[PDB]
Amino acid sequence: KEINQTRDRLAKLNKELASSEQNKNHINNELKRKEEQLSSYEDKLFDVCGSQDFESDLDRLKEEIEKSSKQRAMLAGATAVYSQFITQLTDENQSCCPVCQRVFQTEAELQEVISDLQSKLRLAPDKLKSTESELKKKEKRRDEMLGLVPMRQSIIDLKEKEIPELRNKLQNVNRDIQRLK
Amino acid sequence: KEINQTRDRLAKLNKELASSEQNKNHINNELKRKEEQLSSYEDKLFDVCGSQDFESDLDRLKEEIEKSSKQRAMLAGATAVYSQFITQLTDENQSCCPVCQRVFQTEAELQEVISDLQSKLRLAPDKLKSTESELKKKEKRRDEMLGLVPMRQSIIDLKEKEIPELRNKLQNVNRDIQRLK
Ligand SMILES: [Zn+2]
């Protein structure tokens, strides 16, 4: 049985080496996925935050969103008001002022007042679009931030527990492989 | 050699069932946890926002926030424009009109105009407070659902990916078991 005993160990050792070799790839691939997963979170977190203080970035982002919308109000308000004035002074049979209700004594006046308002609104609709794009962009950024708040933990769990734990598994399996060869 | 072999078939089959039975337990305990985990996420999400359709409710809330904010923008702007008019005729001691720039000959006129602008604005504060209130409530609910986005992601991973995969491993393993016994 002596030769047969050694036949037995040799087979047993091969079954050990094969299953370790399996794990090594298995683990290696899990490590690869967890690292990519982390890498992605750090990229999104990076694209989304312009600083190290989250509560502050969010606070400063909120202030910007407030400025833009106040701007939006101005543009939107003036646009509507003047637009109405202009349509009163033209399409309606008013030869008078829309604010002080005073008749325009000469036709020259009427045109210049129309003329003044026409120019005051001259870039207004255009600026209102730009402001709306920036406002939309900011809010979207705000939305993503609020969604990354609750996996602060998860991103940290990968970096400090799971991934180093896996490298440790890969180390132990690598020790087992070298023990056999 | 017939008996010796028949015990042999029996040993292998018993060793298959033992390892299969093991899987059923391991797999079952995995399914038990994923199901609890899913169950808790669903309870939590529903307790925070009472939403049964998440992506659609959130998208619609966002649309409402957009319409309401657009409305208020135009209201506030328009109010600001007229407010400015009034402050021009008063605090700036201007005796001219802001639109047609025509001087006020009498204080009587000027007063009529001042008085005229104020009444146009008399309903403004009430509308502005109402609109900002409705809007504040929508935003808070939107912020809360935004904090639940990754929890909704987990719920979707559990319900559509992880748990059906496990139920399928339990199916095939159960068949493997029933085939031996
Ligand atoms: Zn006037």
Q: Please, what is the angle between helix B163-180 and helix B2-48, to 10°?
A: 160
Q: With the C-alpha atoms ordered B96, B99, B101, B106, is the resulting torsion angle positive or negative?
A: negative
Q: What is the CA radius of gyration of chain B?
A: 36
DSSP code for A96:
B
Cα B92 to middle of ligand 1, angstroms: 17
**Which bin fits B145, alpha (ψ -120 to 50), beta or left (φ > 0)?**
alpha
Cβ pair B50, B178 in contact under 8 A: no
- The resolution, in Å, is 2.4
Q: Name every residue whose Cβ is closer than 8 Å to that of residue B113 and which is 6 or more positions away in sequence.
A: A99, A100, B89, B97, B104
Nearest Cα of chain B lies from the Cα of A23 at a distance, in angstroms, of: 18
Minimal Cβ distance to B74: which of A76, A99, A113: A76
Pairwise CA distance, residues B179 & B181, whole Å: 6
Distances (CA, A) of B89 to B104, B113, B125, B153: 10, 9, 21, 58
Closest to B102 measured CA to CA, from A75, A108, A87, A94: A108
Token pair 């604010």 is found at A99
CB atoms within 10 A of CB A141: 18
**Method used experimentally:** X-ray
Alpha helices in chain B (DSSP H): 2-48, 54-89, 107-120, 124-147, 149-157, 163-180
The answer, for A73 touching chain B at a CB cutoff of 8 Å, is yes
Q: Please, what is the angle between helix A2-48 and helix A124-148, to 10°?
A: 150
Pairwise CA distance, residues B126 & B124, whole Å: 5
Q: Say which amino acid occupies B149.
A: V
Closest to B159 measured CA to CA, from B41, B62, B21: B41
CA dihedral A116, A117, A122, A126 (to 10 degrees): 160
Token pair 């109402």 is found at B130
DSSP code for A151:
G
Q: What are the domain boundaries of chain A?
A: 2-180
Cβ pair A146, A49 in contact under 8 A: no
Q: Name every residue whose Cβ is closer than 8 Å to that of residue B42 and which is 6 or more positions away in sequence.
A: B155
Pairwise CA distance, residues A68 & A128, whole Å: 10
Token pair 């016994």 is found at B181
Minimal Cβ distance to A80: which of B74, B143, B148: B74
Of 1.10.287, 1.10.10, 3.40.50, 1.20.120, the CATH number of B53-147 is: 1.10.287
Closest to A55 measured CA to CA, from A131, A145, A127: A145
Ligand 1 ion local residues (Cβ < 5 A): A 97, 99-100; B 97, 99-100
Alpha helices in chain A (DSSP H): 2-48, 54-89, 107-120, 124-148, 152-157, 163-180
Cα A102 to middle of ligand 1, angstroms: 6
May I ask the CATH architecture of the domain A2-180?
A: Orthogonal Bundle (1.10)
Distances (CA, A) of B172 to A40, B99, B150, B157, B158: 35, 82, 32, 22, 20
Buried b (16+ CB within 10 A) or exposed e, A98-114: bbbebebeeeebbeebe
